[PDB]
Amino acid sequence: MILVFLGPPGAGKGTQAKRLAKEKGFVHISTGDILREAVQKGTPLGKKAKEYMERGELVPDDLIIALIEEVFPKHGNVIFDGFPRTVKQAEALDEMLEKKGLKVDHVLLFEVPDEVVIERLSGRRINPETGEVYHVKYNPPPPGVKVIQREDDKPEVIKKRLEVYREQTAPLIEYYKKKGILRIIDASKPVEEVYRQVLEVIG
Ligand SMILES: Nc1ncnc2c1ncn2[C@@H]1O[C@H](COP(=O)(O)OP(=O)(O)O)[C@@H](O)[C@H]1O
Ligand SMILES: Nc1ncnc2c1ncn2[C@@H]1O[C@H](COP(=O)(O)OP(=O)(O)O)[C@@H](O)[C@H]1O
């Protein structure tokens, strides 16, 4: 089975993907995580991607599509978490899967309002050692655990990332709706509840 998690930044897509991968054995493909590790290690991809990400812009499709080809696993169920982000990327994903005898089974659309995305993103914190994602209010780091805020979770980059989401990524909703595989998730609910809905959606 192949899943795509779609929706605004801060919706809780990564948090759910990591849980689903962990408990149910999906391969988690987070273009976010892979890009950040590239940036940190300073690869050709990392150096090229770094500024797009810092500014809240999408990294160019060619770079991402190639990144997906490089990481797509030969076997196993897959969660596409943060990819595709454009219509071009969605077309590429279809072709790539079709060549492998595959297809996207379910697109979970993580619906959540702007005030919730801003609330979620501004309080997001990261454990630099473990990659564990926290939230200053909803799931705070344990006492004594040093965390960081991502530079792209600053107020003005969030604002940009949301315009970019609405401009470039939101058309994917009709794209997958037209195929009859769009599932709606009420992402505004607490973590446990969203996860139950995710499990119910996918069986
Ligand atoms: N599929 C993609 N296509 C283009 N750029 C991407 C993609 N995934 C991630 N990025 C870059 O990485 C940044 C952070 O993405 P990500 O971590 O997936 O979302 P969020 O920051 O909302 O969790 C994006 O703003 C974008 O610049
Ligand atoms: N259901 C939820 N309720 C409250 N906070 C959440 C929920 N899901 C995730 N979060 C928190 O909100 C922020 C965004 O979650 P994340 O999974 O990183 O979003 P995305 O991957 O869609 O950008 C994180 O700080 C996370 O701890």
Swiss-Prot record:
GO biological process, one term: nucleoside diphosphate metabolic process
Catalytic activity from the UniProt record: AMP + ATP = 2 ADP
Domain of life: Bacteria
Locations listed in the record: Cytoplasm
EC number: 2.7.4.3
Annotated pathway: Purine metabolism; AMP biosynthesis via salvage pathway; AMP from ADP: step 1/1
EC top class, as a word: transferase
Region called NMP, residue ranges: 30-59
Any one Gene Ontology cellular component term annotated for this protein: cytosol
Binding site for ATP: G10, A11, G12, K13, G14, T15, R120, R124, V133, Y134, K189
Domain description: Consists of three domains, a large central CORE domain and two small peripheral domains, NMPbind and LID, which undergo movements during catalysis. The LID domain closes over the site of phosphoryl transfer upon ATP binding. Assembling and dissambling the active center during each catalytic cycle provides an effective means to prevent ATP hydrolysis.
Record's subunit section: Monomer.
Protein's name in the database: Adenylate kinase
Annotated organism of origin: Aquifex aeolicus (strain VF5)
